[PDB]
Amino acid sequence: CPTHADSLNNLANIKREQGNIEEAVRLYRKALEVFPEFAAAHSNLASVLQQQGKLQEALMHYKEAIRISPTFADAYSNMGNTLKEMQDVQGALQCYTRAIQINPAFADAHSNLASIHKDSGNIPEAIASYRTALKLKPDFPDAYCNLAHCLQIVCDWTDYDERMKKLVSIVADQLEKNRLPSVHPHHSMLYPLSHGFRKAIAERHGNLCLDKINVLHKPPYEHPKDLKLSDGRLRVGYVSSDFGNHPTSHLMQSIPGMHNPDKFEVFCYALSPDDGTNFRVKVMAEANHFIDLSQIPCNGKAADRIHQDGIHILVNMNGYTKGARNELFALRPAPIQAMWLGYPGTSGALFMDYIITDQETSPAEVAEQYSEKLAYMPHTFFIGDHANMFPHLKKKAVIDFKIYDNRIVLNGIDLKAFLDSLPDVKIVKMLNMPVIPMNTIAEAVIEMINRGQIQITINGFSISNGLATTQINNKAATGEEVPRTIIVTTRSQYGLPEDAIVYCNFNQLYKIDPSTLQMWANILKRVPNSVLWLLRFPAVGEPNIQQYAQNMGLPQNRIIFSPVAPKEEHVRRGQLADVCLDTPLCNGHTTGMDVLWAGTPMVTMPGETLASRVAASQLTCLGCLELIAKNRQEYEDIAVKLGTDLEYLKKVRGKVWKQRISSPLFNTKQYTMELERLYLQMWEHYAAGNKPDHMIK
Amino acid sequence: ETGTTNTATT
Ligand SMILES: O=c1ccn([C@@H]2O[C@H](COP(=O)(O)OP(=O)(O)O)[C@@H](O)[C@H]2O)c(=O)[nH]1
Structure with a gap:
């Protein structure tokens, strides 16, 4: 009975809109009992299965829908969304393009296609496709908001004030109507949304994780209430998709190894596979334990691993960024769960306890902006591995080409030895700044830059053109290794004015x-x-x-x-x-x-x-x-x-x-010790039977 | 990772 199935399908659609996904699934399935060859119910069921992270089951139903109806455009576009989530971009593109071939005026498909262009770095084409979508369906929050971000990326400020007004109005409507906002949490900082709106956006994205873990039917975990099983050591788990050549690693790659093994046992949970860089190598070697969770795609089994490791404090380094698996945190395998460093904002999420921040970044008077309790580091929560990665920049010398400190600069691990080989080096006292006069050696260096030469040798020392680092040592260029030559950097290399x-x-x-x-x-x-x-x-x-x-x-x-x-x-x-x-x-x-x-x-x-x-x-x-x-x-x-x-x-x-150098800012040794003191505050608090509270002294 | 839009068929 297509008529009865149609009624069930429509009712399922309504429940779906209301966020009642379980009832929708039940109704779509009932529709298929009543009318097994119902292409629309297959496709609609697949879309809600996708929402629950049941991707392979979703694919099966999309394919069933298309078998029944080969020109079913909605099924192709929807299937494309599932393939995209599966990281099959070619497949997604093939699906979206097929959908548009069938229905040239299919707004959703144009918008979904646009999302691929956006992710590929083809902003103009993304903008064109989003605009087509909005032309065909002017009331389209996903397309409008994603278009707004495209425009933001390229500093296209066309009708900016009205654009912001509309974004805010869209978010207000979605929040009032209990829909997932079309503005991504990570982007909400860029628009004139109230702090209440930003937290509510984050909260709703956090709740999506529940759709994906609810279908796992896992009980709450029993957590450790002391450190006896771990020999008095606090077990800290760092969870990140960014152990490798990523800014996160460029900030904290030294911290795991700097933890005190007497009081802490460090577990690093990688959500990404090995990218082959020294960043990945370093963290894997220096953590007490390194676990590649990219090999365990099921969040249930992955959470089980974290729990069975006995983690006391689990640290979320992704928030709402690419590669995140916040589902792991939603399962609460650890008694204390903290946001740290990787995400610049609140999770808004039920499953996060703390955000590690500081008094300057998050003053107490703005506690209302965060769902987490504030956990203050004593100076700044930010840190960087610059002193370890770029020690050649701790000192510099300049050439006096006429004294400027920033027109022609030399840096190098062997810089002082090079300077000692010259008979006429002067010092400008500030540490202080050595100056090379405009001599034969200075002309040799300048000539190299002007002639676009890669490097020369002076007094046995290799002097490298700073524009040619990848040609000399690509590991030194990426920051995986410290450069071993003296490097020359000049305003002329970049067309900057000398005066x-x-x-x-x-x-x-x-x-x-x-x-x-x-x-x-x-x-x-x-x-x-x-x-x-x-x-x-x-x-x-x-x-x-x-x-x-x-x-x-x-x-x-x-x-x-x-x-x-x-x-x-x-x-x-x-x-x-x-x-x-x-x-x-x-x-x-x-x-x-x-x-x-x-x-x-x-x-x-x-x-x-x-x-x-x-x-x-x-x-x-x-x-x-x-x-x-x-x-x-x-x-x-x-x-x-x-x-x-x-x-x-x-x-x-x-x-x-x-x-x-003298301040704590780049001091990873000091930072780690302060981080540990904070961890122990969190633990002592939890061990005394307390729920999270602000640690802001 | 830009989000996409599922179409509900009536
Ligand atoms: O010419 C450049 C400009 C920036 N970066 C790096 O690119 C990343 C930019 O990342 P992001 O935008 O997230 O930086 P953030 O927002 O944290 O300042 C950082 O690691 C920079 O060090 C780079 O390698 N070369």
Whole structure:
């Protein structure tokens, strides 16, 4: 009876919309009992199975739907979504393209196709496909919100104010109607949403995990209530998809090995396979235990492994980012579960207990922005492995080509030995800065740069062109190894002015908004002799930024773009800037640590969101409060002072140069010890029978 | 990892 089955199918659709997925599944199945050859019920059932993470069962039903109805466009598009989740991009594309072939006006299929282009880095095509979707279906929250993010990525600010208004209105409607918001939690920081809206977005995404673990029918775990089974050692589990060549590893790769084996037993749970890098090698060798959970795709069996390991504190380093398996945390295999470092915001999730942060980043008065209890590190929660990865940058020398500290820079593990081989090296006392006069050796180096040569030899020492690192040692370029040569870095390599101030920002362009570019333009106009240095991150954002800047009155030559560089070159070339202008919308995080390691002062204006306050936290730890602006006028005033008062610039640069070493900011040994003290606070609290509470002293 | 849209067939 297709008629009765149709009624059941429609009722299932309604239940599905209401978030009652179990009842929907039951009804679709009943529809198939009444009408076994019901293509629509097969396809609709598959979609809810997909929601429950039953991907192979979903595929089976999609294929059944298409067997019954070979031109069933909805089934193809829906099947494409499942293949995409399965990491079969070619298959997904084949499905979406088939769906559009059948129905040229299939809005959802155009939007789903767009998502592939977006993920591939083809933003213009994503934008085109999302626009087609919105033309065919103007009320389409998923397409609108994903289009908004595409535009954000390339700094396309067309109708920006109205766009933000609509995003907020969409989210409000979805929240009121109990639907999953079309704005991703990780992106919510970029839009003028209330803190309440941002937390509610995160909460609802957190709840999706339950759809995927509910079908596992697992009981609650019994947790350890003491450290007896572990010989008085606290078992800490670090869970991350980013053990390998990823910013997360560039920040914390040293921490597992630095933990005190007398008090802690460290387990690292990798959600990704071995990428073959030294980052992966290091963590695997230095953790007490290393577990490749990428080999255990079932979250149930994977959670079982974590529980059976006896983990006391399980640490979520992904939050809502690519590669996350928050389902593992939803199963609570550990008695205490903490967010740390990898995700700049609240999980909003029932299954997370704490967020490790700090007083500057997350002041107590903003506790309402987070579902987790706040757990303060004593300085900043941020950390970086720069002192271990890039020790060649601890010292520098310059060439006096006329004394600037940032026009022609030398760095090298054997730099002092090289300098000692020269008869005429002078010192500028700040540690202090050796200067090579404009001699035969200096011309030799400059010639190498101008001739585009890869490297030369002087007094037995290899002197490398900083633009050619991948040709000399690719491991040194990625940061897997410390470069063994003396490296030359020059403003001329990047087309930077020799006789003007360079303001830089090396972040992905999506962190810039109209208000920020306007601030920057205000600074440039007040400091005639200056340029802004940005990255093609991505390159298609460049012409957009240029257009807005030109319209603000800045000629094209005041904004210099460089390509994204290998890790080592990126950190090293920060030495060429005078000042970094931080993005207030979302700060540099890793990027902030990168620029400070070069000794480059960073001007920041902290906001209310965690992501907007990290840079100020870094600077507070560094001991440079003069770089923290309370408002737009001050941000501008500070940057302008640094660009016009060269004696003040010199003093602030010296402060950063010294304090990156003397302060706790890059001190991983110290950080780890403080992290441990915090872990023990959490444990003692739990062992006394307490639920989580703020650890903010 | 950009999310997608399932179509409910009536
Ligand atoms: O020219 C560049 C610019 C940046 N990066 C790196 O690219 C990553 C950017 O990641 P993300 O946007 O997440 O940085 P964050 O938001 O933490 O500042 C960081 O590891 C940078 O060190 C790089 O290798 N070369």
